[PDB]
Write a protein that binds this ligand. Structure first.
Ligand SMILES: NC(=O)c1ccc[n+]([C@@H]2O[C@H](COP(=O)([O-])OP(=O)(O)OC[C@H]3O[C@@H](n4cnc5c(N)ncnc54)[C@H](OP(=O)(O)O)[C@@H]3O)[C@@H](O)[C@H]2O)c1
Ligand SMILES: COc1cc(Cc2cnc(N)nc2N)cc(/C=C/C(=O)N2NCc3ccccc3[C@@H]2Cc2ccccc2)c1OC
Length: 163
């Protein structure tokens, strides 16, 4: 089980406003689709309710304390510890709560930096590039449907070594 974070955050690490993405950026949702098809998404309950339905062609896992929670096409877990029993490549998909709980545990992060400043009410936790190697950094292409500059980062946790 490779464990990754998958997230879009803006210049101030805003990830959400009123249970929605603050930005309209089709290409990032395509990026998300390409990375996670055939794999597993782990998400908190609020993030799932925002999307409204499972994303097709991958395993949709929802973390919640609700023992009544049962949705067709969705697997449910009730603790963080359950994440580690999931097979394959697992992506931590959001939202703020799950990111805060997992950022110290994941192998790597796929971050789309939205190069703007949006009003938000939910944030990605602060992190420093002193701790994370830039495996790749790719500028998103802008066009008629995708008008906010954005950058795809793949960050891998650096190892702590003596001097
Ligand atoms: N920009 C991005 O890439 C991105 C990605 C995803 C989401 N978002 C945004 O993030 C925002 C939502 O984040 P959020 O923190 O408010 O909600 P969230 O993390 O999506 O969901 C929180 C819920 O997850 C469940 N949960 C979390 N940790 C748990 C644990 N250890 N044990 C049991 N249950 C647990 C609880 O559900 P119960 O209360 O049901 O027990 C909790 O209330 C939205 O605005 C959304 O638009 C942004
Ligand atoms: C809070 O709301 C949301 C949060 C996130 C998390 C997220 C956001 N961004 C980053 N970077 N990380 C992330 N964790 C995500 C979504 C998007 C879901 C979604 O609709 N899709 N996702 C892939 C997918 C795969 C198959 C079919 C449809 C889709 C569509 C896009 C699409 C539509 C048509 C064709 C191709 C793709 C979302 O809802 C707006």
């Amino acid at each position: 089980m490779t464990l990754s974070i998958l997230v879009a955050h803006d210049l101030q690490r805003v990830i959400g406003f009123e249970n929605q993405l603050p930005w309209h950026l089709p290409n990032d949702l395509k990026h998300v689709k390409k990375l996670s098809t055939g794999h597993t998404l782990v998400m908190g309950r609020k993030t799932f309710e925002s999307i409204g339905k499972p994303l097709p062609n991958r395993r949709n896992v929802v973390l919640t304390s609700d023992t009544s929670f049962n949705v067709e096409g969705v697997d449910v877990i009730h603790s963080i510890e359950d994440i580690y029993q999931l097979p394959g490549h697992v992506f931590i998909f959001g939202g703020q709560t799950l990111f805060e709980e997992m950022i110290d545990k994941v192998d790597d992060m796929y971050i789309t930096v939205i190069e703007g400043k949006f009003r938000g009410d939910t944030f990605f936790p602060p992190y420093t590039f002193e701790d994370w190697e830039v495996a790749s950094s790719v500028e998103g292409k802008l066009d008629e449907k995708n008008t906010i500059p954005h950058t795809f980062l793949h960050l891998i946790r650096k190892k702590l070594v003596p001097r």
